[PDB]
């Protein structure tokens, strides 16, 4: 039977290479990748692709890998795709590892917005846990020269990592990525998926998707937010995407918000992301 060689950058930027069928479904990929990783709390995660106009696309395990990639190369990220709101409650030590490795990149990409004392805390964190205690016959000198904190290192920051990882000592790896995680998750910007759009009258906005709802950031401010709970309906036609709100106490209709996207197929990601994080996080 005929195989494709698959590529996945892992969050470590190391590749994994393995072969599927060309006609497996994305389930079957993202198994292998799992296993290699010893991932059994695979639910928050997901592989992404990009598309023919060079935009992030979520692997859907139960839709063809080939009716996905379409006419682009078989290679792919494996990613947190569901940011849990509370990492404490997750079974496993590697779980929070790997929410630890995606988050890192969240930072160093300027993707997740940082106060200087956060990425310091985060830096100090990781270095404790992969490092172990500080050792101070080094008194000065940088063995942190390898470890990414932020989209700007400055001499002010490695300095701050450094005295908040003196204080760390005796800590253990899990005990210091769950530190690592409860700093993170009070980030504003914490598993937001963020997305460009117009409001009805035309006006730049950017939708966030996240466990809390769709947020909208009307000015750079979170001017407004849609909790799932609110939300009945997602769609989207031609350029636009639409949210349908159950109606108010006391109101005799729903009502239905209207956004302008990039083109069709940003609004479609959209849907499709507002979506799935509906689910996943939906009041049960
Ligand atoms: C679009 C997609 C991605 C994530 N991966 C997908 C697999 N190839 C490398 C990039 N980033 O922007």
Redesign the pocket.
């Known amino acids: 039977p005929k195989s494709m060689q698959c590529k996945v950058?892992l969050l470590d930027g190391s590749e994994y290479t393995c072969d599927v069928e060309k006609r497996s479904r994305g389930q079957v990929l993202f198994d292998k990748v799992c296993e290699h990783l010893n991932l059994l709390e695979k639910d928050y995660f997901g592989l992404?692709?990009?598309d023919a106009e060079?935009?992030?696309?979520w692997l859907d395990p139960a839709k063809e890998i080939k009716k996905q990639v379409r006419s682009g190369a078989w290679?792919?990220?494996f990613?947190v795709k569901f940011y849990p709101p509370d990492p404490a409650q997750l079974s496993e030590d590697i779980t929070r590892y790997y929410l630890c490795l995606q988050l890192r990149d969240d930072i160093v990409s300027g993707r997740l917005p940082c106060s200087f004392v956060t990425l310091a805390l985060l830096g100090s964190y990781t270095v404790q846990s992969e490092l172990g205690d500080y050792d101070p016959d080094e008194c000065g000198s940088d063995y942190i020269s390898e470890f990414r904190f932020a989209p700007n290192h400055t001499k002010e920051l490695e300095d701050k990592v450094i005295e908040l990882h003196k204080s760390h000592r005796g800590m253990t790896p899990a005990e210091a990525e769950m530190h690592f995680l409860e700093n993170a998750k009070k980030l504003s910007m914490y598993g937001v998926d963020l997305h460009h759009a117009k409001d009805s009258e035309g006006v730049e906005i950017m939708l966030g998707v996240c466990a809390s709802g769709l947020l909208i950031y009307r000015d750079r401010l979170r001017i407004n937010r849609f909790a799932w709970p609110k939300v009945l309906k997602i769609s989207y036609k031609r350029n636009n995407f639409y949210i349908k709100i159950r109606p108010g106490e006391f109101e005799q209709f729903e009502s239905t918000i209207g956004f302008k996207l990039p083109n069709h197929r940003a609004a479609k990601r959209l849907w499709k992301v507002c979506v799935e994080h509906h689910t996943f996080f939906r009041l049960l």
């Open positions: 950058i992404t692709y990009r060079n935009q992030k696309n290679h792919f990220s990613n």
